[PDB]
Nucleic acid binder design. Sequence first.
RNA 1: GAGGUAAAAUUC
RNA 2: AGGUGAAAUUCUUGGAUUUAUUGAAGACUAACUACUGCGAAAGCAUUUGCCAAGGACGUUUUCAUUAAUCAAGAACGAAAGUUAGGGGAUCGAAGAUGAUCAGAUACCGUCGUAGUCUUAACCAUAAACUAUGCCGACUAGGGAUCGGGUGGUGUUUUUUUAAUGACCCACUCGGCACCUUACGAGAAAUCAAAGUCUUUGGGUUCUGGGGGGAGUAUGGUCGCAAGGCUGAAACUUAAAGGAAUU
Lengths: 201, 98, 63, 25, 91, 127, 214
Amino acid sequence: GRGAPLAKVVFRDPYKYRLREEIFIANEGVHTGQFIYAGKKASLNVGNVLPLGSVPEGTIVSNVEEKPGDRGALARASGNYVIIIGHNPDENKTRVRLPSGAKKVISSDARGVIGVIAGGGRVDKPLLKAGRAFHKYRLKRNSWPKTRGVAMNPVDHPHGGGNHQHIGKASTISRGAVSGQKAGLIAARRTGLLRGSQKTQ
Amino acid sequence: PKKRASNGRNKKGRGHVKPVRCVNCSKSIPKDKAIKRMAIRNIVEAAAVRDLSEASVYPEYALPKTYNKLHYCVSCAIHARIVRVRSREDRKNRAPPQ
Amino acid sequence: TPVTLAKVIKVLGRTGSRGGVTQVRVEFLEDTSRTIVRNVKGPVRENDILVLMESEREARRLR
Amino acid sequence: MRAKWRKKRTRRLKRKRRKVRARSK
Amino acid sequence: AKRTKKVGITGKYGVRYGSSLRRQVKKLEIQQHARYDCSFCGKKTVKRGAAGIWTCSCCKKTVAGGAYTVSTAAAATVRSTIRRLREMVEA
Amino acid sequence: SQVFGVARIYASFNDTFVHVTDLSGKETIARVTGGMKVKADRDESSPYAAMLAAQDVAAKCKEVGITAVHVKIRATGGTRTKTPGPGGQAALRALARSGLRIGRIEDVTPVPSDSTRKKGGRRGRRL
Amino acid sequence: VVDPFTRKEWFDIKAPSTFENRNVGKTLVNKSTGLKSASDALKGRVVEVCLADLQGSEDHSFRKIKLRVDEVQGKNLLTNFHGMDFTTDKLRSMVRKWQTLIEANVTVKTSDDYVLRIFAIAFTRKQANQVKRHSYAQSSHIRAIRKVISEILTKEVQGSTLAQLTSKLIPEVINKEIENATKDIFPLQNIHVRKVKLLKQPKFDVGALMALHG
RNA sequence: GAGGUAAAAUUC
RNA sequence: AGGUGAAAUUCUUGGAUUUAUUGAAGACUAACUACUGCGAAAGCAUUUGCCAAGGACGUUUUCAUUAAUCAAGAACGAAAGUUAGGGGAUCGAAGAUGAUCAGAUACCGUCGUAGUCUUAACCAUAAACUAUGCCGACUAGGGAUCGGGUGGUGUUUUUUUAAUGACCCACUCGGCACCUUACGAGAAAUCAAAGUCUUUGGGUUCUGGGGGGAGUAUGGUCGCAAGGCUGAAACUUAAAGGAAUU
Ligand SMILES: [Mg+2]
Ligand SMILES: [Mg+2]
Ligand SMILES: [Mg+2]
Ligand SMILES: [Mg+2]
Ligand SMILES: [Mg+2]
Ligand SMILES: [Mg+2]
Ligand SMILES: [Mg+2]
Ligand SMILES: [Mg+2]
Ligand SMILES: [Mg+2]
Ligand SMILES: [Mg+2]
Ligand SMILES: [Mg+2]
Ligand SMILES: [Mg+2]
Ligand SMILES: [Mg+2]
Ligand SMILES: [Mg+2]
Ligand SMILES: [Mg+2]
Ligand SMILES: [Mg+2]
Ligand SMILES: [Mg+2]
Ligand SMILES: [Mg+2]
Ligand SMILES: [Mg+2]
Ligand SMILES: [Mg+2]
Ligand SMILES: [Mg+2]
Ligand SMILES: [Mg+2]
Ligand SMILES: [Mg+2]
Ligand SMILES: [Mg+2]
Ligand SMILES: [Mg+2]
Ligand SMILES: [Mg+2]
Ligand SMILES: [Mg+2]
Ligand SMILES: [Mg+2]
Ligand SMILES: [Mg+2]
Ligand SMILES: [Mg+2]
Ligand SMILES: [Mg+2]
Ligand SMILES: [Mg+2]
Ligand SMILES: [Mg+2]
Ligand SMILES: [Mg+2]
Ligand SMILES: [Mg+2]
Ligand SMILES: [Mg+2]
Ligand SMILES: [Mg+2]
Ligand SMILES: [Mg+2]
Ligand SMILES: [Zn+2]
Ligand SMILES: [Zn+2]
């Protein structure tokens, strides 16, 4: 269910003699037996997790946290990364660049592992047959196949019905609608083929 | 026929150097093909230097000069009276006219 | 409106498309150390006192 | 006429001709 | 003896699946099933495990990498970046 | 004895901007353009409309108290004709005679290491 | 409709004590009322003024100093050094035809945490009794001259403060030290300190600003 | 060493 | 306010245009830039580092002719265009509008995709022109310049005289070139090469045989496509074309 491989990075408990084994997300370039460092005073090497208040600008990191304590929220899929584009010494803020392109500022006390996540180029191969789409999606949920709502009955989808295959009304349904109406393009600011740019954010 | 020697420019064994843009009509042209006029001027005119010496609060002051290098294409250096068509024997004169 | 007089000290020549505008460098009678070239219309000799409606105006070449 | 727009005249002549030839094979 | 003219490895699929799709699959199955070099033992004994797992046949080493290659072009500019920044910390 | 300011005469084609500002540059006082004085939309770069625009600025500086000024001639610059218009020499002469005190004339035309390809096409503008 | 000029209040400019003739000019700031008062409206305003007025001499009429406002006390603001920039008419009189232009840059921090980038322009000098006109460089001395320049520029800076660097640019002491270590390489002329701008200020140390005014 | 400048105008 | 020869479209107390403080984004490398450099060509102008490559010069070093030119074939090959990602500030084929005009699908004005940028592949044509194959020898004078080297009763920088570097003079190679000439060559324009050619043989590769129809038809091959390469006939005409003078 994940394009990225895991990692059995095992730690030691500093308060009782045992071996606590944890599961990370494997970056690209790590290997079995690498000394993975975890701390604020740790060095800046690929595979180590560091707080964002102790790294300079431009460090390509991943598995960055929103708030310090949620054990890894943002940038977890295969082949993704965020870019620290600026710091703030006052009130310990750190401005990062999310993979969607959303420049959002977070706390400097949040953590993040150095480097891009292993598994890049996964969606660059044409997943040709439906059998490869079957064995992919049967390990996730019951969301495959996807029947077109025009082809089904008027009781089954708001677009279906009629003597032809047509929607009938506008596919742009507002955000302030209720369930049962939210089909097609939910609250679209723009529609049609992208013949412009990425001017804002 | 071949009325000239380099025939358009000052390129001697290079093939291609640099394209530049004209200032009068925004025409793309090679740098050695576009003629050059280092049109050096004073920042004030000859008639505005009398009233500026009376309005100056400075005892002595050095007059600035606006230096600029601007290029012309062939089509907008002949319509504007910059260069003129010459006789067949006087093409070879490469000295600046005084 | 104020009136400003000017005496002709030097004449340049005819400048225009049809040839009816003369470039004349006049010198003011209230200031004997400052001159402004003006464009006139009619027959102008030297040492003629003209009446200028606008005091400060630099004359260009008409085309 | 100009030797470039006679060339493009024969160029679109080729695309129109081999398209009729390809739909009869 | 080169038997197929241009399809090579994607000739297993046959006539189906289009032309421009199987050309892109051929690009990511030559690199996928390739025998790569190991950074540790030096021998060309690297076999692909799962999607992202790159094991080695000798010395039993396993390096996490890309989905269809060992080191993609995205991580090639990451490691060169950390090489530059680490020299400024120690100097 | 003399309070100072900067004038920043933007002498482009088909308009002349004259607005005297302070030494910090934040505050602007007495903005008069060339198009305000003539109802033609042709003589906006004329030397006549630039002298009436410059004397309107200096008639308001007498009300404020600005007696001296550090004028700054400026063309359009960038990827443009980078040459001051006809109303630039007219603006320097007008506000100097009107009563102001001129100090340190200079030029602030923006001239880059050229980029951002110049408007007009490759083969050029023509008529 | 009301005139805003009664609302505006005059505030004089007082330059620091790295030179003479402190009085620069006056500004116009609105009265100290509520809704973004005058004290918060003077948090940084550069004043691009040439140093030919504060020095008196006219041989330095091509060097402009930026003065950023930092502290206001008793209807009187205090300022600090922000940057140095040459006038545009001087560089155009520097650059001539038939000579080689050499520019060099370096990023260097002072004794305190002032991150500033200085620029250095230097040209080739046409030697006496020379027949040829251009006297171009060998285009490998330029790599060697700018190695000497970038060593001297990181010697005056990173060996002194900003006030020891501000009061040194006016007697052109750096420009003489470049000439004293380049004449064994190539004959140069017109060595200058063309730009310097501050990239980051460290703190709100009042004791370094009040020590420059008294 | 600097010194003005673009309307339209097709055929026998 | 924008704009043009003149205009209108457009933006404007929603306070535009302008002014200052910054910040982000890509692109490009002005002035210096030169009858100047390098590369087989296309081409290549910010700094520094790394990685290799090359010409010229110097050489009382080496191998011993290992060479010269080139069907088939291979590498590279501006721009535009194609496929898949990232970028997408300007400019901007299509297109929409504003004028001009008898008409204006245009020139001009404004806005704006594809494209311009980059990675990974393709395509591989240009007025890809110096419209001038390459190798070798000989024939004529002159002033410059680039790169290397050798001589000076040299100049300057100098700490104590130096040594270098820069510069000057003289000479010699390898350059990009230029000027004056015609013994020579050409139909002439012109050319140190297009010269040493009826007093027509240095080695060698390619192309052309009146103008059209044809760079078309068909066949083969290459390419994802647009296309590239190879390439006629029927028929028709007696002129087409070059240089120069009035
Ligand atoms: Mg994942
Ligand atoms: Mg699903
Ligand atoms: Mg199902
Ligand atoms: Mg579906
Ligand atoms: Mg579907
Ligand atoms: Mg479906
Ligand atoms: Mg049904
Ligand atoms: Mg229906
Ligand atoms: Mg349908
Ligand atoms: Mg409905
Ligand atoms: Mg969009
Ligand atoms: Mg001709
Ligand atoms: Mg070429
Ligand atoms: Mg015909
Ligand atoms: Mg059919
Ligand atoms: Mg257009
Ligand atoms: Mg014309
Ligand atoms: Mg440059
Ligand atoms: Mg061949
Ligand atoms: Mg290309
Ligand atoms: Mg774009
Ligand atoms: Mg159109
Ligand atoms: Mg119309
Ligand atoms: Mg159309
Ligand atoms: Mg149009
Ligand atoms: Mg060809
Ligand atoms: Mg050519
Ligand atoms: Mg040819
Ligand atoms: Mg000779
Ligand atoms: Mg001869
Ligand atoms: Mg024939
Ligand atoms: Mg052919
Ligand atoms: Mg064919
Ligand atoms: Mg065929
Ligand atoms: Mg393809
Ligand atoms: Mg074909
Ligand atoms: Mg025939
Ligand atoms: Mg004739
Ligand atoms: Zn032009
Ligand atoms: Zn191994």
